[PDB]
Symmetry: D3
């Protein structure tokens, strides 16, 4: 198996069975049409790849991802058929990460916004920098938060924190995110990647079935909320034809 | 739309599209029979009022609510028909808040007990003062905790904390409440009201569908526990016919500590 | 009602209607074949005993329980009918504790591991010492975490913390456990027992139906995850026939999977 | 007061039975006003102490042909209208299922789309042998998001739900009873009397016993709320798609659609 | 030994089938002791190595007419008794559902209320053509909260479930089988022998296979536990209402 | 796209946008090692194929599938890694079919057993021959019914019929299967194939999103039973290490 079907992504296989997946693109790793599809569809390939034992996922440089690019949001608003495509991709990103038994570790440095946040937060283990900026962003942009949060935030931070950050879109930094249960760990910015790599390395060298089946069991908690998640997806893509988003991209 | 159908409630529409809903009654805003119905029934009306874009709910003065009045409890204990009316109101309060798409911010100062705590905690964004007193209160009175906690607490503070506080009825202060995830925010007592108004104002001026649909999606987590919550409701209202609640009431009126066993 | 049908467990009924259930056995209160069955089957009996109004469950000495003994694991690996018997006990432990309406307080000093952690955490109110060691332990041994965690951890600590600790098997100390929501209370190691006995005592003097029906209502959150729990059980017991557990057990005699 | 719902004729009987009548042109088509009134009447009925049961029917020999040409046209061509219709669709199902007052439906002739929603979410549905029960969504070119995803598998089993909802083959009242979709099948002439009898007997019954039995059973539908809401969203997304123009053209032209 | 259940006659055959018979005046009416015994037997059966299947039936030509007048009176008239009867009603459904041993019911004549519970929660139910299946609760003036909310929609679909449970119209075995409420309908005289045969074959089958198939299918009911327990609470509340005192008399509310 | 990654299955793309998936193998289309994997992994590929608008799935000749082959059963009992590989495939077959938005029609003639019955019944629309034999078969073989039945039978035939057939393994013929709700339709054996094709063709010509989104919404009723289904998978594959399936196999 080769990761050439995913040309927007940089996939590197170490000797320990860790696959590094890097988001590397302009505008602090913004997610364009090709990356949005690649992020969605890579997971079932990784999960059938016998050479891979763990995934380490990150952005290049001092940033996870600023999320969807101007062009991606444009297409979503201005074209039905493209909207439908991008919607299916948003759905599958969540469904495929959640159904991937291979453990995943995220190293979150700088911003993680929208589609980028999905990947950051649906990793099994998430490592955030003290100063990392975790931004769901949807309500301020003017659309419903339908790309992951309804499937997991309550079961990460409890309903009172979830409602607060998701409705207000107040900025949440890695240190406070760790305090409230959104991420597994918080470490100094400079140590985010090495901390994550070590965990990923340990998982890769661990007892495989034990690890994967533990993951899989726990993931039933998210899968049970699949219909609630897909409601949120529908409502988000509906809202993309609404007035507010026009003002929202302008700001 | 006018809020005259809810005479125990003072409702004030702001310039900002925020409806302030004030609980104001004697005994630190105790909830009597009219207010129990009014609290239960107002939400569906609020939700269809095109002039309202957010709700700020609070108590008059420096108290949220002491919960059900002695008259309310007496009626529950002593009369079948009244018990069922109250039970329907208890159930609908939770169901109607949770099905209300309009965002709600609570400003929690002083005590928020029983039926008052329901409203304080089912608000989307709850703002508690450092020394605010959050008291479910049911097991110490001698009845099951069936008025909201079973639909939400484990998804607020996790099961180990839910069980500790709901079973022992130990008082929980605002600061500790925020630490463990029960409320959205903890501020100084003198800042609760302006902080809550700030948040309500900002939601009212935001992307309406985005906000309402996000909230609605999140509320499915509570909706999926309706049957569990309705179990808790039946168990509480059944326990009102038991001897323990008579003792709890009697102990209170008699200024002593309850002896249940 | 006589607790003589559970010979590996010491059961002492106080004046206050508190049943103290002590776990006391070699290797830090390890759970052998008899205790595994006793711990599973004791709860329905306690739940129907009118002399009991609360349970306080603890380890003898400065340990809660190290979980499965080497012999119990050996049988699980070596013998099919034994494995099935044990798997049924594992499932029943969780099911029974969760359907016990009588309130249960755990006093956690020292290690609570595997089967030991199950009982410590499915108590209604868990009191952990500052340095108590809470270790699920499954992935480190080479088996799926199928003995309780999948029914409850996401709803105790949130999924990010649940995965961290269940996948890595990093040790969790009672103070940190309390911070992230795994346990009800953290007190000084020297104050664990009295804090817990005090809590059991209050519960046992409380309004019985109110307390029991509140617990029951709350327990529906775990009961709706039964199929997810039973999934994890099967995956654990399937993985007992895998190579990794032979390596993981050998490692703990003398860890390279 | 029921004058808040001017599209619907609401007649209170001596027995405590509220009769609710869908009376309009094109075999009781549901236009803008009726779509909202149908959605919003149930919580008011539920809180009315005069009412102990509901009998719901169409005027004459028809239940409802469903959405009128106008209502569909709005859904297709106007955004804010589409949202208002969407909310209404969601609320009809949600409000019917949360109405504790028992509801009996008298199904004669066509019961299509929006009209079918009311006919099938009734607690007790009485179908004439020749009644035509038609979901209609895939044939019209939109997802079936107005009620079927919340109940059909639990009425007819997933094999029949898939067959009828995907193909949109017509279901006659007789075959509908055989497969579990409706409570009872009778001769077209007895539908109305059979239904009124049942409404009457429930209205005379033990009020809490009946309302609480129905509430309990309705949890099976409530637990499917998020699945239903997915279906609503998808139906309303599909209304911006290319198929529905051709689907409505095809309907209006008494011909088979060419997608 | 089943001596802890004095109201029930339990006979173990040479094939591993444990026959459980309800035998009591008034067509096997279920009194205080029977109500507790029926609730508390299944966990014992399920850990009994000698038992491989259960065959449950009434004595004579009747399954059970349900709770007796005195059991009902107790529910109406006293709180501690009402609560005990409630725990029993709830554990009956729970304990049958959690019993991995397969259970065949042989239903002849009436099966009403508490007795219908056992009839329908058996894994395989055999009804006679003229067996009378009567949930009975609304006719009696209480919510139907002793089992139907955990199973009927998944047996007969919601339209049929609502019709029979709201009206309490009598449902005969032949019609019960057609709508999917019972596994099988046979001629009245063949009920017991058809049921015994089925239980016999099950007692001889591959044990883990059978029990685990059944267990897995039972999750469909376990997931509906809270909805069931909602219906239990609603039934027991309604026993304090006015309707039931009249309904026990009979039927005019 | 490339159906050559599925060596055990014959995939033919029609003019009407219908992909016909033929199960054509020894022993009345028995499912061996290669077919068990191919059946599991094909569905996500189909669902992403823009050339395909509907699937017609069928066995070669007058038989759907006799299910898992002797070798597959021997591999399940005999070897741990292979047992685990087979278990994953059983799990994913059910998971992937139910998550495939593309409408699927099954044409059921003669026997459809175990692993074949899976594909047959999780088709959106199943067309059954009057004398087609639908056999779950797991209790007769000595293993828990963990390959699909626990995700769907109660919502097909109701619990009383589910427990009768799955516990006893009594034979269920296509006519009776339709009566009780297990299959969409029952036609004469000779008409199964053309009836299935017609239905596939119509669906393939329909409003694509309308159909796919309706089926997806309905399929949530199955996704919500995923953990019950996975419990059953687990109990089946555990029971393969038991003493019972030795005799069970030796018989057939």
């Amino acid at each position: 198996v080769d990761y050439h079907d995913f040309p927007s992504l940089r996939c590197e296989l170490g000797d320990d069975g860790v696959l590094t997946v890097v988001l590397d693109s302009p505008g602090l790793n913004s997610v364009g049409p090709q990356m949005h599809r690649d992020l969605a569809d890579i997971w079932p390939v990784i999960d059938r790849d016998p050479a891979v034992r763990a995934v380490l996922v990150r952005g290049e440089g001092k940033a996870f991802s600023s999320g969807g690019s101007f062009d991606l949001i444009d297409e979503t608003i201005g074209d039905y058929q493209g909207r439908i495509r991008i919607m299916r991709e948003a759905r599958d990103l969540v469904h495929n990460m959640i159904n991937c038994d291979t453990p995943v570790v995220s190293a979150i440095r700088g911003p993680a916004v929208g589609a980028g946040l999905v990947v950051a937060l649906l990793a099994d283990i998430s490592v955030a920098g003290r100063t990392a900026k975790l931004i769901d962003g949807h309500t301020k942009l003017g659309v419903a938060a339908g790309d992951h949060a309804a499937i997991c935030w309550p079961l990460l931070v409890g309903m009172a924190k979830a409602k607060y950050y998701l409705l207000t879109c107040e900025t949440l930094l890695g240190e406070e995110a760790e305090r409230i249960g959104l991420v597994s760990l918080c470490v100094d910015d400079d140590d985010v990647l090495s901390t994550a790599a070590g965990i990923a390395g340990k998982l890769a060298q661990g007892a495989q079935h034990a690890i994967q089946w533990t993951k899989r069991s726990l993931n039933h908690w998210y899968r049970m909320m699949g219909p609630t998640f897909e409601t949120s997806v529908g409502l988000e893509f509906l809202s993309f034809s609404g007035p507010d988003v026009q003002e929202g991209l302008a700001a």
